[PDB]
Amino acid sequence: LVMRRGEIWQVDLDPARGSEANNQRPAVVVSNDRANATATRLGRGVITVVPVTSNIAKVYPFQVLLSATTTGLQVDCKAQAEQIRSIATERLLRPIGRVSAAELAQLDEALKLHLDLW
Amino acid sequence: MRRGEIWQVDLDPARGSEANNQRPAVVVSNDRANATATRLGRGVITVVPVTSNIAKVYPFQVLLSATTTGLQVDCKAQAEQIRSIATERLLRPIGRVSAAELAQLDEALKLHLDLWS
């Protein structure tokens, strides 16, 4: 339960369907820390995250590349704003790391673009 | 398939306090991504689930009146339940939200997702 924004946790997105993100994948906390803090004090709750995938072959504007050097990821991964999803905190396995502030802002912009926000 | 449309979707299987079962939801992904979803025939779009419990409508939630949308009963969209789904999960298109409701949903999404800056 110690989830805060910009943190990278390993989460279990399965079961999944279609072209959705599946399996146990790293993901970035994108919900605001008020909700996340409330999850921690409760021990139960739901938070929103953006999955990353290791397939960094092509990066789209709504996707942001995250560097394994600093992030605690084992390999460079790309966050997929189009895979955004809210998750019960059952799904949190372990805390991987934190995204850089540059990566965090860039994901903010990718989310604003993907969700038509302003 | 465009932004602000209300479709019925299948959120099952689900865990914890997630939105579950077959529910209406609002398309919040931009019409650009949705257009390429329609071109591929497979893909992901992002939607906000709706719930029947109107006892309290929280800041991150937006009230939809069944008059405006063609919904069967007055419902609230839950930005805190936002999630992307494969287009397989779109069962049928119920209706469309009003432009005012859409604006408040934009604003609720900024609040829940901390997209102020």
């Binding site: 409330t38 | 579950n20 309290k56 929280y58 991150f60 839950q78 805190e80």
Partner: peptide
């Protein structure tokens, strides 16, 4: 209080 709002939004019945 917004966190009260969140706790109750999660716990209140959806289905």
């Amino acid at each position: 209080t917004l966190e009260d709002d969140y706790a109750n939004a999660w716990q209140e019945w959806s289905a």
